Paper text:
The Nsp15 enzyme is active as a 234 kDa hexamer consisting of three dimers. It was reported that NendoU cleaves both single- and double-stranded RNA at uridine sites producing 2′,3′-cyclic phosphodiester and 5′-hydroxyl termini. To evade host pattern recognition receptor MDA5 responsible for activating the host defenses, the Nsp15 cleaves the 5′-polyuridine tracts in (-) sense viral RNAs, which are the product of polyA-templated RNA synthesis. In addition to biochemical data, we report five new structures of the enzyme in complex with 5′UMP, 3′UMP, 5′GpU, uridine 2′3′-vanadate (UV)—a transition state analog, and Tipiracil—a uracil derivative.
The structure of the complex with UV was determined at 2.25 Å resolution. UV binds to the uridine binding site as observed in the structures with 5′UMP, GpU, and Tipiracil. The uracil moiety is recognized by Ser294 and Leu346 defining the uracil recognition and interacts also with Tyr343. One oxygen (O2′) atom below the plane is interacting with His250 and the other oxygen above the plane is in contact with His235. The vanadate position is consistent with 3′-phosphoryl group that is cleaved in the RNA substrate and observed in the GpU and Tipiracil complexes. The vanadate interacts with key catalytic site residues including His250, His235, Lys290, Thr341, Gly247 and has several water-mediated interactions. Particularly, Lys290 makes hydrogen bonds to O2′ and one of the vanadate oxygen atoms in the plane reminiscent of Lys41 in RNase A. These interactions confirm previous experimental observations for Nsp15 and are consistent with the proposed SN2 mechanism. The structure also provides insights into the structure of 2′,3′-cyclic phosphodiester, which is the product of transphosphorylation reaction. This structure suggests that Nsp15 should follow a two-step reaction mechanism with the final product being 3′UMP. The Nsp15 mechanism of catalysis is consistent with that of RNase A as observed in the structure of the complex with UV transition state.
Residue numbers in the entry:
A (entry chain A), B (entry chain A), C (entry chain A), D (entry chain B), E (entry chain B): 0 to 346
Write the structure that this text describes.
């Protein structure tokens, strides 16, 4: 059954744990796993987790290598544990959940989710696995994803992108958009209307709408003129203000990407994890403008336009709730004389 | 007052220590600081210093987040300690000074620089902080920086660039050029005439003079012809010689940048720190030419021209002293028959 | 003689160990070596090996800084130890061999290869060093490299590239192609006909033949038409198939380089070492196609064409042996109705 | 500087650092220093300090092997650093002082005490070493020990015992009683008329007076009668109360020794260091009585009798300062109806 | 190879590795091996060796639990490695040998001693195991122990005592006296006529002869009289001098045992390993006499009397070679006027 040397055999021969028989010699020094190859030791894994090195090594080998939802999605849905699989958080380089079910003896709380210890927990079920749809039908609290329809259950469509081996992508040779289902205390839940973040990054940013194409290809004055955005303070919120010591606005990722192609800047991710809203310590190299906590979100520009245009601007300041990635994101809206001053999210 | 959990609260909520009240749960494993977020541990800080992890974590959170002089400047001025702040050396990923004054209990030698323990040390004072100019007037040995004039003190103007959160830049939304002052044994010192290095890097090198623009845009034969530099061995010193096994010359950073755009090469910084002269183990990928110790300095090309043209060339070899970044840099000048052979600095 | 502080003196002053006299203060914390510079500690070396930090630090300082064969070459020839030098494996960031001869007291099994302990081992000799050719003539088992001819020994010509300080290159200011010789049990061996891998990488890939230039500059249909490669399944083997969940083929490095310029992808080197065949866990960002174990080899495209055209295609599946880098590489050849289906190597 | 391997050579060949020349192979793993003895590694030093392993090993090797004052004596005199020697704290298994003077390059703030940086520090001088008395006269702050009189210096006779290699004892083949002198800001200070602790331990404990001899053999009631100790709470202060959950009194070490021979108990030294007054968490194995903080001190019984009998019993609670080991010890004095209730020291 | 979890299973269920099948959950943290016992982690092995934690744990589990020779015996015979077993050095808490033969894949240089790589190594064979005597005949270098005679092999009778699980004793329910044989380069060597050390320790010490019985009960003067030891410096060599600062003589263990019962003292084993002659840094608790290097050996008193009485006292200083534990021990012999002054062993 279980064996450290057998786990390393699979990694060496199959790139991951594939249930194959065999053993290779291993050495444990510090938080690193080595193996002997022609008389020399070769590093296989460096433990960046809070778990023992041999345990964390086992879970990483048994990680899910299929398209899975991003961890922030699972977090916003309150997933506590997965059923007979391991979700690897590549943002944290660690397992997404503390315990396991029928995966690793050191972390297993149960062999099956049918066991009594799993009832209060929100177990994640994968409909692509045989028998897991019915396990969800018998689970007290759980979350389920499927590719197609499910009889007797009104689905909730997720985002276009999913994580495959740490790579977030919109699948073309594989399906990445799932139907979502959730039960709480044996009662199926009606998932709310939500926006979805795009999970893009600066180095490889690509526009996904004609408005996003126009935003990047055109100038600030023309873009505001084309889409009639006067009074909404896009210069501050999206384009960002760099004239002063403290950086102004710059809360949309597409705004950061437009600047990065022309002027570099430093982003310090002082909370390195997968979350819908990301906070950064930013310093602009060209001007010297900086801000300690700059909340950034990767919303589609069209969706962001709809949100800010759907608000009341008669109050100097108030808190705005927006359901994004199935979680309720709080926004700070500042207005003066019927026009927007700033509008930023909070974590 | 002090608290590890309170320090992490500020980092999580404010990106740094901002004196706010609150606590978050933390874990110390190896040289890393974690915190719990929705039941999982998230890395906040990895100790790359020789100090205890919790102490180094505290100093990094309390680091100075305003434009500060680069560490090499402070080193050349003999700064031993800073007054009620922490200068973070991003080149070393560690505090620039061993002890502190009124910052961290574990490293504090004093609460104020007025205390008797601070008299022999060269304390760094920031004139932008209230009351620190007069503290410098009462300090026995110290260094002071200001933005404007100071009554009764003849200032010394520093370089255009300063470090902001590890980013060296010439500020446009903030001031980065300061006036410099120094006292030794209660006696104000007259700072010497000095050149200043430019603190640029290869990936983002930008010319800062028409001569530098001509150097990068033109060829070697034309550049020497335009600025009449025959007999000074710029082909060796600046452009570099790659025909032989040992690399020849290549001691100016602008020379490295011109090559890097056309041919890649490997630079091994065997002394990773902030210093006016940087020594590298270089290996040219295209040709195979290499040199163990290649001293490199980032001087403005015009300033470098003035220096080498201001020397006597009648001796085969001698040592040349040049005041750069307020420190006296030794150069090796080799000549033959009234013409320069090579001219390189030493660390 | 030997001294930790003296070794660090050479590194600081000469970039490596140069047998110079002097000492500097050092600190050992975790797997890292520091030294004091103006009262602060500066990191000199981080031990990424399975050896003690001070020992590994000594061997790294005494590493060979001349053009040396790549480790995979030495591995395929069965080199167990080097004579009075240290070969540093930059792929593993560790010594290429466990023990040493006359280098470090902690790892020395002998002072000279003439000693009785060295007879069974395959000792690597460098003909560029004085007296090492005759030592090879007296060694029982050994490997030798030279630049020119050797009297009484029929040479075997190696590859054009060699490793210089971790930089694999074809030397232009230095010679990188050597003559190879090997003795087993006092008997000179006749080295077999072998192909050689090119040791290129994706970021800096350059074609080395007109066929390689045509492969990158032209389309798939035209390239197959120009070089008449119908029925050999280059679309699968070289260009790669991304239409399905599992990635198809893509076993030649030049195929990866052509894709990388247009579409990015993730390569996970789960066995980080120098080997003729490299296995990767690949995930294509654009399509989502992936494969756990994708064997890749960097053969010249012309050589690869010659190999696959020199095979019999009448069997559904068989194992093909090819001598590459002096080792016998096993290939899997799949055919159907006289045409190639796939052809990939194994490690 | 110097050589780590040379330090290890002296240890194996001289038991300590004797300045002899020679070197041996050394391995540094974890916080442990090993050496190769005929192929196998032998542990030489387990670093239990807060300093780097190689540094602390050098300081432990250079520890003072002559009879030296106990660390509690030096601390009570405000000693900050030693002159050209290392005082080893065996009860902490660590150096008694942070920095050094002319001992170890890593910890040296100076090579000689006359250096300007040593002025504000109370430097410890050993008069038994040549030139150290004159260095004391030059020093601004310092403490001096001698075996005889110094010209014009008013001596302070210290305790009979001293520490020889972690062993506290009255020297018979050596002199363990010294004259003590102290300077504060260039001014000699008269040391106070003080008591001294006996520095005995629990398991090996010998009485040093007829009263102490009587205390161990006489019953509680008959001992109080012979020495007229009615109304002084000796039963509580010295004998101890075990009838209640919180342990009553028991603050003299000789009282602990008398009980330990009769009944065992546990002592938790939650502050493991050498100090005049020691605090212990004590649990009695027979009764179950316990106290979280029990202040204990090893005074001669005759001294404690003389001390407690010179007090005024007309106050309900009084703070009493007593000079012991050159420092003021504060006592709590509870009385009722002209009789002592309890009288315990405080740390 | 095999399984780390299987090794831990045998330890908890058999006290050691018994080859049984089964597995238990294991955690590796620091250099400690834990296992889960009803939810909690129980420490199983603290790695005190220079090998990886998992490797050393496997070797300790596979240690030889039969009576084996003491490590000082094997070292004195030049034993480099063991045949299909592990000898545990309990005085080092580490394997007695670096590599293994058919024991652990990580440390195995070979599976069987007949392999060609084991030829230049002195392999230890246990004649009590089937086939090991024949493997000794095939071996080029080796050492063999047996309980009885071997055909045609001239035996060497070893000491009465052996080590059973770190316990040295004379076997009563087992045989601890073996015949010893040795081969050097295929040639059997006659082992020298030797003495043997008694391998007793200080706290638990029993005399083994009437002379030793008399030594412990008789006074110094009356014991020398009964055994006619005038002019042989027994008072210095065996009894020891405490009147001076440097400790005089004291080189026989039975002399140490006689003093320890009367007065305690400290022994610093600065080279903690098993060897025929042990060096200690000694400090006497009563007098204060001390010596940095005090050579001690545990010989029977009758043997030492026989040895010292067969010497020639007509030389001021002489080096004396004595065969003890199959190795030559060098002695310093100082004499004056035909009388012994001191006679101490050297390590």
């Amino acid at each position: 059954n279980m064996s450290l040397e057998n786990v390393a055999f699979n990694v060496v021969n199959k790139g991951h744990f594939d249930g194959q028989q065999g053993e290779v010699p291993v050495s444990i020094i510090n938080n690193t796993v080595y193996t002997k190859v022609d008389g020399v030791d070769v590093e296989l894994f460096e433990n960046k987790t809070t778990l023992p090195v041999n345990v964390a090594f086992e879970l990483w080998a048994k990680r899910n290598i299929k398209p899975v939802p991003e961890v922030k999605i699972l977090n916003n849905l309150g997933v506590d544990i997965a059923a007979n699989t391991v979700i690897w958080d590549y943002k944290r380089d660690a397992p997404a959940h503390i315990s396991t079910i029928g995966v690793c003896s050191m972390t297993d709380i149960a062999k099956k989710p049918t066991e009594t210890i799993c009832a209060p927990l929100t177990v994640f079920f994968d409909g692509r696995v045989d028998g897991q749809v019915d396990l969800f039908r018998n689970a007290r609290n759980g979350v389920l994803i499927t590719e197609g329809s499910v009889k007797g259950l009104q689905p909730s469509v997720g985002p276009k992108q999913a994580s495959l081996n740490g790579v977030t992508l919109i699948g073309e040779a594989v399906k990445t958009q799932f139907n979502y289902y959730k039960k709480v205390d044996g009662v199926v839940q009606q998932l709310p209307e939500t926006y979805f973040t795009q999970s893009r990054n600066l180095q490889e940013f690509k526009p996904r709408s004609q408005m996003e194409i126009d935003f990047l290809e055109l100038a600030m004055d023309e873009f505001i003129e084309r889409y009639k955005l006067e009074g909404y303070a896009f210069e501050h919120i999206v384009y960002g203000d760099f004239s002063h010591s403290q950086l102004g606005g710059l809360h949309l990722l597409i705004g950061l990407a437009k600047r990065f192609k022309e002027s570099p800047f430093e982003l310090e991710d002082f909370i390195p994890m997968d979350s819908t809203v990301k906070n950064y310590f930013i310093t602009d190299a060209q001007t010297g403008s900086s801000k300690c906590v700059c909340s950034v979100i990767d919303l589609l520009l069209d969706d962001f336009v709809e949100i800010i245009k759907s608000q009341d601007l008669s109050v100097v300041s108030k808190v705005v709730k927006v359901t994004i990635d199935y979680t309720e994101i709080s926004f700070m809206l500042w207005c003066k004389d019927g026009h927007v001053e700033t509008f930023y999210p909070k974590l």
